[PDB]
């Protein structure tokens, strides 16, 4: 599908509300495998299970190992811009 830009809003007491799988060391994109109901990704409306996370706040995640992606994603705060695509 088309590449989309998605805005997520989160407070500092919460996580993103997603589960991710994959990573460069597995030859697979960083994929959203779960969206936890009521948490920031669900509330933002624009992220879905099966989306590939291509970038977050301008940081490219297309060539990123799993734990690299976890550190990068968990460091973002507040108003967070995602670049995603559903394949």
């Amino acid at each position: 599908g088309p590449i989309r830009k998605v805005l997520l809003l989160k407070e500092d007491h919460e996580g993103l509300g997603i589960s991710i799988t994959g990573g460069k060391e597995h030859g697979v994109p960083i994929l959203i495998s779960e969206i936890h109901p009521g948490q920031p990704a669900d509330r933002c409306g624009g992220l879905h299970v099966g989306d590939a996370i291509l970038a977050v706040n301008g940081v490219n995640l297309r060539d990123t190992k799993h734990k690299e992606a976890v550190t990068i994603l968990s460091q973002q705060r507040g108003e967070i811009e995602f670049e995603v695509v559903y394949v």
């Binding site: 996580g15 993103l16 799988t21 779960e34 976890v70």
Partner: peptide, 8 residues
């Protein structure tokens, strides 16, 4: 089982 999953 080969792919990792992290809750974030």
């Amino acid at each position: 089982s080969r792919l990792p999953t992290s809750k974030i």
